C-alpha cells in the first residue's frame, strides 16, 4: 500500500514531462539535451612516484532543442538572424520538470548567457510521415541545478 | 448463520524475537537427540523418518 | 579498554596473535590430549571451531611450552577446520559416538590400541601416526613399531617454528590441516603430497632420497622434506599396507568418503517397502551420487559405464530370507586413478 | 502519559550545571524505557542571556533522521544544524559515568565533526529497551499494525476476517522487513504473525467480539563501542 | 483399512479483495512468479545454471457492468504523471458454504495499467463485461 | 543433490546485487564501470635477438556512475559543483557485491582517492518513457580487490 505522496517523495522521475523558459518567455519544444559539466584534468608526476591529478578548467555548454514548426512561427530562426558580427542578444534558459498539469516544479536546470551558433532545418522528403522540425544549438556560461 | 458477533474489541501484542532460523533450531535438536542416545550408525537410521519441529512460546 | 564504559573509539597496544577462520566436511580430525590438560578434564568431548574459541576456552595467553596449543595452532594455520578434543583414555569410548569425525590425529600422543580398535573396515576413519622422534636408522628398521593397517599413515620427522621454544610441533596436526586444505581444493582423491608447509614450519632432521628409500614400501613413512626450489613439502602419500589396493591414502580416503556418502543417500528407504520400487530409487540415488562424482574427476574412465556399476535385486544381492528380514544389499564397485611417484629422466647426446 | 500501548517518547533536559563526578546527576529522573535525557544545554550566536534546551533542537534531529534513514537507525554521530555550541564539554571519562543505568546523552564537540550527538540509549539499562531506536521502532511498528486493522471492525468474528487482518499484518511487515528496519536473511527470520483461535483467542474473547493478534519482530541493534589493538610485530 | 481419498478444490469457490473493500468479480488470471536463468560456460565441461532476477506481477481481473458502477476506472483515472494509489489483492479459496477460508493469494503493491471496456454487439444476447490489468510487486500463497 | 551452502561456496557470482560507498555514507547506484587496472608495456630490442618486455607505469582509473533522478537529490551536482580551482573534495568508493538482503559481503572493490571530472544530466524527451538518469565520472588514484 503506497500514496501517491509517498510515490511524489521517494519515487524517482520521469523525462518525458518538462518546462522551458527562454528568456521572459516560455516555448515548448519536443527534445532538450546537452546539459553536461565536464573539467579538465591536470596531471604532475614526480621522479620518486607522487603522482597529482586535480581538476583543469571549466568548459563551455553546448545543448540543443528540438521543436515542431508551426504556422507563423519564426522565432528561432529570428533570433539566430539578429547577429551582426560578434552582437547577438544572449538569454538564459531554465528547463524544469513540472507535475502532470505544470502547476508545480520539482526541479530546475539553469543555463546562463546562451547565444546560437546553428540552426536546422527540416528536410523535406515526399515519402516522409512525419512533422516538420526544427533543430537549435546553444553555447552557454555554465549550467546549474536547483532543486524545489 | 445465527450468532456471528461483529469484531468490536481490537488488541495487538507486539514483541521482540531472536534473529533466528526455525531450520538450524531443528536441526540443532535433532543433532543434540541423536549425540545423547548414542550416536551409533544405528541411532541414525533409527532417526532417518523422525520430524522434530519448534513453535515459538508465547509464555 | 576491555571494559566498555562510554561509546566511542578505545585504542590498545597489546594485541593476541589471531587466525582467518576455514570451513570444511570431508576431513573432520579428533586431536588425542594428555590425562592432566585441565581444559579437557570432566569433559567426554569438546568442539573447537577456530583459533579464537579455542583460546577463549583456554582463558590464558598462548604458550609455546605446551603440546596441545602449539598442535593446534599448527593445524589451524595450514588450513584446518572444526575439530574435536577427546582424551587419550576415552578414544575408543568416544570416538564412535561421534557421526561427522574422519579423521585421528595423535598431537604428540600414543594411539595404537585406539587405532588398532578404531580403524577397520566399514567404520571410515583414518589415523594419522607420528614417526620417531629420532633418527632414522640407515637400516630402515624405524618403521617396526607400526601395525600394518590400509586405514593409517605415518608422517616423519617432527616439526620446529619461530615460536617454537622447548619442544616440537607433532607433525600429524600440521598433516591435518594439509589434508583438509587439500581436499578443499583439489578433491579427496587428489594425493595429499607435493604441497607446501604454512606457518614457516622446518623439518627437524633433514632426509635425502636413499634415507627415503630404505622407508618408501612395505610399512611406509612419509616424509617432510626441504627443497631449494620450492620449500617445505610433503614427500609422501603411502599408507602402511603395501598391497595392490590401499596402497594410496588418496583411495583409501575416497572409497571411505564414498561409503560414507553412498550410505547417507539411501537412509531414506528405511520403514520403506522392501521390494523393486525401493530398490529402484536406491539405485537411482546411488548412480545420481556416482555420475557426479564421475563428472567431478573422482572416478577414472570415458565414460560412467567404464567408472562404476551398482546391483542390487532379488537373485542379485539379496535373498529370500534376506528380504524376510527386512535388509537391503547393495553392491558398488569403482575405479580410481593411481598418482605417478617416479618420473625417469633419460638423457642423450645423439639428437 | 509515557507508559506502554501509548504510543508516545518523552525527551527530557539534563542539569543545567556541570556533572558531578560520582555520577549523581541522574538521579531525580525516574527510571522509564519511553524516555531519554540529553545534557548539557545548548548556546547560539544569536543567544543573549539564557540558553537553549537540548530537547528542542534534538526533536529536530529525530526528525532529520527519521526522514533520511529511517527509524530503525540511532540518531546518534549526528551533526546539530545552525552552529548550535554545546554549553560544557564532556570528557570520555565524565561520560562513562553516565552511560549506564539511567544514562544521559551527551552533546559533544569534536576536532574533526564538530558538534555531534553521542548517545542513543533510553532510561533503563536491560537488554530489551535499551536503546532509544528498538523502542521507537516497536512503538513506530505498534501504531501501524493498529492502524492496519482498523478496517475489520463491525465484520463477522469469523476466520475470513482473521486471514484478511493477517495478510495485511503480514504485507506491512514484509514491507518493514525489505526496507531494511527488521533483522534476518529471510522474513521467516525476522518476523511472525499469530491470530485464530485457540492461538490467540477463546469462546469467550469471541463471543465478546475481541479479536487477539500477536507478533514478534527482530531489531538490529548498533555498535557502541570500537576497539582498536595495535602491534608492532607486523 | 479406511483408505483415505482427498479431491482438489472447485477452481470457482474463490473470494476478492481489492484494499480493504470485497469485490464480486467473474475471473481472475496471471498470478504466476517467474525467475530468469543465468549460466556459466567453463571450458572442461561445467554447466553452472541458478535462478536469476524475480519479475513483476502482471494479473488481469474480470468482471460485468452494473449499474452506477465505476470504482475500477475511477482508479485507473485517478493517475497524475507518475503518481497513483497501491492496493493490496488478496484471492481466497473457500470451503463450499463459503464460511472457511482453506488457501490465499497475497498480492502487493498492485496498481492498474490499463482497462478494457465492454465490447458493444448489438447481434449478441450476452452480459457487458469490463476488464483491468494491474502490475504489482510479489505474490505469495499461504495455507490457511 | 546441490544445497544452498554447495552453491554459496562453489558458483559463480551474479553482477546484479551490489552496495556502493562514497566517502562515509552510502548510496544506491544503477550502474557501475570502468575499475579497470592498465600498465604499459616497456620494450628493449637487442642486435642479437633479445627482445625484453617488462611491465610500465600504472594509468589512473576512471568510473563512471549512472544513478536516477529523485526529488530534492542534488548530492553529486553539489560534489561536482564545490571546485574551486584545483580543490576538490577527494573520498573514496567501494563496491561490494552483497546476498540477497544486504546483510553479507562476498567481494569488494576498493577506489582510493576519486573525484569528479564530468557530469552529464538526463536528456529531456517528451516522447520517452524512461526515468530521468543522472552521470558522473569520476578519476582515481588505484582500485584493488579485497575477497571476503
Redesign the interface.
Given at each position: 500500500?503506497?500514496?501517491?505522496e509517498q510515490?511524489?517523495?521517494?519515487?524517482?522521475?520521469?523525462?518525458?514531462?518538462?518546462v522551458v523558459s527562454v528568456g521572459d518567455e516560455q516555448i515548448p519544444?519536443?527534445?532538450?539535451?546537452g546539459?553536461?559539466?565536464?573539467?579538465?584534468?591536470?596531471?604532475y608526476k614526480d621522479g620518486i612516484g607522487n603522482?597529482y591529478?586535480?581538476?583543469?578548467q571549466?568548459q563551455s555548454i553546448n545543448i540543443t532543442l528540438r521543436k515542431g514548426v508551426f504556422p507563423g512561427d519564426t522565432k528561432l530562426f529570428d533570433w539566430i538572424n539578429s547577429i551582426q558580427l560578434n552582437q547577438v542578444e544572449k538569454k538564459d534558459i531554465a528547463?524544469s520538470?513540472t507535475?502532470?498539469?505544470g502547476t508545480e516544479i520539482?526541479?530546475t536546470?539553469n543555463v546562463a548567457n546562451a547565444f546560437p551558433t546553428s540552426f536546422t532545418s527540416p528536410s523535406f522528403d515526399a515519402t516522409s510521415n512525419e512533422i516538420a522540425v526544427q533543430e537549435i544549438a546553444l553555447t552557454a556560461d555554465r549550467?546549474?541545478?536547483?532543486?524545489? | 448463520e445465527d450468532n456471528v458477533i461483529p469484531v468490536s474489541k481490537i488488541s495487538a501484542s507486539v514483541d521482540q524475537k531472536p534473529n533466528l532460523d526455525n531450520s538450524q533450531i531443528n536441526q540443532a535438536l535433532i543433532d543434540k537427540l541423536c549425540v545423547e542416545l548414542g550416536g551409533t550408525e544405528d541411532v541414525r537410521l533409527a532417526l532417518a523418518k523422525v520430524n522434530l519441529t519448534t513453535k515459538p512460546d508465547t509464555e | 579498554t576491555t571494559i566498555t564504559t562510554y561509546p566511542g573509539v578505545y585504542i590498545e597496544e597489546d594485541a593476541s596473535l589471531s587466525l582467518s577462520v576455514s570451513s570444511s566436511a570431508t576431513a573432520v580430525p579428533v586431536f588425542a590430549v594428555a590425562g592432566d590438560n585441565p581444559l579437557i578434564s570432566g569433559k567426554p568431548y569438546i568442539r573447537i571451531s577456530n583459533w579464537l574459541e579455542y583460546l577463549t576456552l583456554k582463558n590464558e595467553q598462548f604458550d609455546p611450552a605446551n603440546t596441545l596449543d602449539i598442535s593446534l595452532r599448527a593445524y589451524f594455520i595450514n588450513g584446518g577446520g572444526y575439530c574435536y578434543l577427546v582424551q587419550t583414555t576415552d578414544l575408543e569410548k568416544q570416538v564412535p559416538k561421534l557421526d561427522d569425525v574422519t579423521l585421528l590425529v595423535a598431537a604428540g600422543e600414543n594411539i595404537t590400541t585406539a587405532v588398532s580398535t578404531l580403524c577397520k573396515p566399514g567404520k571410515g576413519l583414518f589415523a594419522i601416526f607420528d614417526g620417531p622422534t629420532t633418527e632414522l636408522k640407515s637400516d630402515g628398521t624405524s618403521n617396526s613399531d607400526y601395525d600394518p593397517n590400509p586405514f593409517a599413515a605415518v608422517y616423519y620427522p617432527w616439526l620446529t617454528a619461530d615460536w617454537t621454544t622447548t619442544i616440537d610441533i607433532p607433525p600429524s596436526a600440521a598433516i591435518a590441516g594439509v589434508y583438509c586444505s587439500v581436499d578443499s581444493t583439489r578433491g579427496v582423491w587428489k594425493a595429499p603430497a607435493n604441497v607446501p608447509i604454512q606457518g614457516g614450519l622446518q623439518p627437524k632432521y633433514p632426509v635425502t632420497d636413499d634415507l627415503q628409500a630404505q622407508y618408501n614400501q612395505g610399512k611406509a613413512l612419509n616424509m617432510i622434506r626441504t627443497f631449494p626450489k620450492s620449500g617445505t613439502l610433503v614427500w609422501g602419500a603411502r599408507t602402511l599396507e603395501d598391497n595392490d589396493n590401499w596402497r594410496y591414502i588418496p583411495v583409501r580416503r575416497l572409497f571411505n568418503s564414498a561409503e560414507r556418502d553412498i550410505k547417507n543417500a539411501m537412509s531414506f528407504a528405511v520403514f520403506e517397502p522392501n521390494s523393486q520400487p525401493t530398490w529402484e530409487r536406491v539405485r537411482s540415488a546411488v548412480n545420481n551420487y556416482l555420475y557426479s562424482l564421475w563428472q567431478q574427476g573422482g572416478l577414472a574412465g570415458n565414460k560412467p559405464d567404464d567408472a562404476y556399476f551398482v546391483q542390487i535385486g532379488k537373485d542379485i544381492t539379496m535373498t529370500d530370507d534376506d528380504i524376510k528380514q527386512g535388509k537391503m544389499i547393495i553392491k558398488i564397485g569403482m575405479a580410481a586413478v593411481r598418482p605417478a611417484e617416479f618420473i625417469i629422466l633419460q638423457f642423450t647426446q645423439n639428437t
Open positions: 500500500a503506497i500514496t501517491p510515490i511524489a517523495v521517494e519515487y524517482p522521475i520521469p523525462t518525458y514531462r518538462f519544444f519536443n527534445n532538450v539535451s546539459l553536461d559539466v565536464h573539467y579538465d584534468v591536470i596531471e603522482y591529478k586535480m581538476p583543469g571549466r528547463i520538470l507535475n502532470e498539469a520539482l526541479m536546470w549550467v546549474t541545478i536547483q532543486a524545489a | - | -
